[PDB]
């Protein structure tokens, strides 16, 4: 009952340079949005750095 | 109804030459199987057909067994004997069961089982009667051409197969073409093609000659050997016991007509016909045709023959891609080395010089005496060590003391050579001395001996650092082996 | 993913007990059960020690009832003629 | 398999309404911190700390 479809990055089609395109499958009928939204909001701000 | 069973049994018995009993046993098994399929449970079922009426009774069979594994189909001997005391292990207990109505379903099952029984009776007896065909050149019609095989129809529901390796390299068959080939193997694939037919193997050539040459079919001429490069060239060796018959002339026929008929059936394959000789050297000369042989040297120990030819005939003796020498070697069973007369003399001079150098080095004799041994036919240290003393005493200038000394030197030379190689690698000396330390495999013993560690003492004298570069030897395993060697050498 | 995972680490020898059962628990036909009771076979461990040849001597036990007993014992992984050392256990000798 | 069974649909789901309301934090002297207050709505079959732990 706690067994889901554990996913994986099937490919990293890094298009050209300083640009990647990472596809992850398979997730549940609803987990693509929650992982996309979680990673999108964290990368946007939380991720530190210098400028 | 009743009389119709008898009329069917009589019609099938007469048409398929099959025992009526075998047809009934099979119909009983067919009806039992059809009955089993109407029940949701796996039951055992016996059917019995009355041989006069054609009426049939169906049972719930109970295979009388010692230990019951399937209670639905098996009964213990003790329980079976409670119903009928006459029953034994392997008999069937019955149970009044409604016989399946003979619908077109049972009818179709009965038809299939009859057809299968005919394949294992009528068709089996036809194959037994055609014992000649099973081995001779059967004729079939091409039913299907696949990439890897050709299916032939032989008639009477018999199917044969020619495999891709069993075809000639340039043959192209179409569905409906007639093809001849030798039945070289009968297996047990009744459903499909149990018969294997060849056109490429030497048996196809032999049987074509048997059909085309009456003198071979009458056993007046015998084919002793056949060597074949399929669709290109073959050689056959022929013998006769009748001195009035030329066996080569008989196989060629008037103006080559017989050999050309065989060649045409084989897609234009060139056939050489040679006289079999009981002398191997004379037989190889005949097998080398059309090349003229100048001399033959026979090495009986290596089962090889060196064939000298004139420099103009060398290319003919070898043939295109070595085809002539290869077919001659396959026909004779000998390995055949084709060279020029000049090359054979140079080879013999090099072998004589190598034998002289070997004898001078190992026997402590002069070059003049080594030359005499080679001229008398001695080429190896083994010959000198083991040949009968009488043959060595026939050599001019050898006395019994000198022959004994020569044999002792040859044996000591053979012993020394063996010991030296066994210590250099891991054959015997290092495979016992260096391998005494528990843990030493033969490979490790040879790796140690390649470093000059030939004995168990040499290993006891090593450090771990001296052995650290040996592939597969860890410092711990090196330390254990050195300590095992020291325990035996210094504390044994 | 490392940041989001670090923000969640504060959250995340008489056979066995079957031999001790009565023969009535084998769901045998009323005939087979009454034939076994007439021979003082009360437990599955008593039944498993009897041979097929001994059961066929029992009054009114037919070949059909013997096949039923085998099929039922086989469904439980038991066979007729197993020797149990120390059967019956002293816990049963007082009923 | 028999004709006497009756199959109902199966809504294996204990919760009904999950509402979070983020709000400012003052317990810690440090400002720009947040509190996450989740009001769930269970039907009684699931403990709330067990629900947040499984999530």
Curated annotation (Swiss-Prot), chain B:
Entry's Gene Ontology BP terms: DNA-templated transcription termination; protein complex oligomerization; regulation of DNA-templated transcription elongation; ribosome biogenesis; transcription antitermination
Record keywords, A-Z: Cytoplasm, Host-virus interaction, Repeat, Ribosome biogenesis, RNA-binding, Stress response, Transcription, Transcription antitermination, Transcription regulation, Transcription termination
Subcellular location: Cytoplasm
Entry keyword annotation includes RNA-binding: yes
Induction of expression: In response to low temperature. Negatively autoregulated. Induced by cold shock (42 to 15 degrees Celsius) (at protein level).
Region annotated Acidic repeat 2 (AR2), required for interaction with SuhB, interacts with RNAP subunit alpha (rpoA), NusG, chain positions: 427-492
First and last residues of every Sequence repeat: 364-414, 439-489
Coiled-coil intervals: none
Region listing for 2 X 51 AA approximate repeats, in residue ranges: 364-489
Domain (KH) ranges: 230-293, 302-368
Annotated region (N-terminal domain (NTD) interacts with RNAP), positions in chain: 1-137
Classification via PROSITE patterns: KH_TYPE_1, S1
Domain S1 motif: 135-200
SMART domains registered for this protein in UniProt: S1
Outcome of swapping residue 181 to D: In nusa11; inability to terminate transcription normally at termination sites
One cellular-component annotation, GO: transcription elongation factor complex
Biological role: Part of the processive rRNA transcription and antitermination complex (rrnTAC). The complex forms an RNA-chaperone ring around the RNA exit tunnel of RNA polymerase (RNAP). It supports rapid transcription and antitermination of rRNA operons, cotranscriptional rRNA folding, and annealing of distal rRNA regions to allow correct ribosome biogenesis. Participates in both transcription termination and antitermination. Involved in a variety of cellular termination and antitermination processes, such as Rho-dependent transcriptional termination and intrinsic termination.
The protein's assembly and partners: Monomer. Binds directly to the core enzyme of the DNA-dependent RNA polymerase (RNAP). Interacts with nascent RNA. Interacts with the termination Rho factor. Interacts with the phage lambda N protein. Interacts with SuhB via the AR2 domain, crystallizes as a 2:1 SuhB:NusA heterotrimer. The rRNA transcription and antitermination complex (rrnTAC) consists of RNAP, NusA, NusB, NusE (rpsJ), NusG, SubB, ribosomal protein S4, DNA and precursor rRNA; S4 is more flexible than other subunits. NusG and the alpha-CTD of RNAP interact with the AR2 domain. (Microbial infection) Interacts (via N-terminus and AR2 domain) with Escherichia phage lambda antitermination protein Q; this interaction (AR2 domain) releases the autoinhibition of NusA.
Protein name stated in the entry: Transcription termination/antitermination protein NusA
UniProt source species: Escherichia coli (strain K12)
Gene responsible for this protein: nusA
UniProtKB/Swiss-Prot annotation, chain D:
Phenotype when changing residue 26 to C: In rpoA101; temperature-sensitive
Primary role: DNA-dependent RNA polymerase (RNAP) catalyzes the transcription of DNA into RNA using the four ribonucleoside triphosphates as substrates. This subunit plays an important role in subunit assembly since its dimerization is the first step in the sequential assembly of subunits to form the holoenzyme.
Primary gene name: rpoA
The protein's name in its UniProt record: DNA-directed RNA polymerase subunit alpha
Higher taxonomy: Bacteria, Pseudomonadati, Pseudomonadota, Gammaproteobacteria, Enterobacterales
The species this protein was found in: Escherichia coli (strain K12)
Signal peptide start and end residues: none
Comment, domains: The N-terminal domain is essential for RNAP assembly and basal transcription, whereas the C-terminal domain is involved in interaction with transcriptional regulators (such as CRP) and with upstream promoter elements.
Residues of the full protein shown: 166 to 220 of 329
PTM annotation, UniProt: (Microbial infection) ADP-ribosylated on both alpha subunits by the phage T4 protein ModA. ADP-ribosylated on only one of the alpha subunits by the phage T4 protein Alt.
Subunit structure comment from the entry: Homodimer. The RNAP catalytic core consists of 2 alpha, 1 beta, 1 beta' and 1 omega subunit. When a sigma factor is associated with the core the holoenzyme is formed, which can initiate transcription. Both the N- and C-terminus interact with different regions of transcriptional regulator CRP. The rRNA transcription and antitermination complex (rrnTAC) consists of RNAP, NusA, NusB, NusE (rpsJ), NusG, SubB, ribosomal protein S4, DNA and precursor rRNA; S4 is more flexible than other subunits.
UniProt family annotation: Belongs to the RNA polymerase alpha chain family.
